[PDB]
């Protein structure tokens, strides 16, 4: 119901390019996922937060690399990036506007990479990524090391 | 101004209110000797003077990333945890630990009773307020709550708070029964 907007709002969820939204409506790393597309495309939030590191250097082979930081012990990276138009310590909405993807740092060809962190631990951005209003289940099914009973009674007491 | 919803979400999720209920005195910890760093003089929280085994309550929603029991030296036992839009909060000195790390947290939840565990200088709960690290005037957060809402807004220094309600007013916007049909 309302629970669910709420939630999605909060935790990452789907895919934070357009084109791979309107195609879904893509190759796994060790670990994370690179999403190839041209430079300059937009890259938009996940899921609402805090801008952890806007870090424009190598940042180990990542390049230009952002890490939003969501409720809950959530994180997204976001990397190779062209260009970054947030700051550390800046508050961005779900869907919200945060870069441009590029070949920067270590990369064969122009991709985003992105991840999904729980407590800094890696966990399967394709979970998360096709987790989405119509299949809502999903991560609660495909991703079961989440104590999801602890987490959305707690999201549902927000909401109160 | 904010609305209603505004106000109760943000106080959930950011630190506010008192951890613990009974205390004599509050204290910047800048004039003791400091728990780690053994000098007075360092940005760094406050200390309530408490009655030993006085429940302690997390000041909002979140996950604990770090506990220290069975320990007396420095910070002594302690609860860490890690809040929505980069703040955390720290609880030191305790006698005893109730929370586990990577437990996620409610706030007003019981997660420890005070101590003198640790460089304490006595009884006391040492606490602590940050922004991505960052030291922040936890007495502006003690003083925050709806009727006086003020309070932890004069901590701008390093935080955004009107991109902050911002965010949060795209949150509770969702409340309306609506919306997005192309
Ligand atoms: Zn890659």
Known sequence: GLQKSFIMRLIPNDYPLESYR??????????????????????????????????????????????????????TYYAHLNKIVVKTGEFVKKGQLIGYSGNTGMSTGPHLHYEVRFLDQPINPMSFTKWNMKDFEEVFNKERSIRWQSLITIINRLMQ | NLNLAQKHLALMLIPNGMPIKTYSAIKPTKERNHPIKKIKGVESGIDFIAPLNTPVYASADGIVDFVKTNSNVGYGNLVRIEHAFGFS????????????????????QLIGYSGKSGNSGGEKLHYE???????????????????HFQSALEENKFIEWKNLFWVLEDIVQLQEHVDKDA
């Open chain 2, 129 to 147: 307020v940050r922004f991505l690290g960052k030291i922040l005037d936890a007495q502006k957060f003690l003083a925050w709550d709806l009727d």
């Open chain 2, 89 to 108: 909060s720290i609880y030191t000195h305790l006698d005893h630990v109730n929370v586990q790390p990577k437990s996620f947290i409610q706030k007003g």
């Open chain 1, 22 to 75: 309107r195609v879904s409506a893509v190759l796994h790393n060790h670990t994370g996922l690179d999403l190839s597309t041209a430079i300059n495309t937009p890259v938009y939030a996940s899921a609402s937060g805090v801008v952890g590191l806007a870090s424009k250097g190598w940042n180990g082979g990542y390049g230009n690399l952002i890490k939003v930081f969501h409720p809950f012990g959530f994180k």
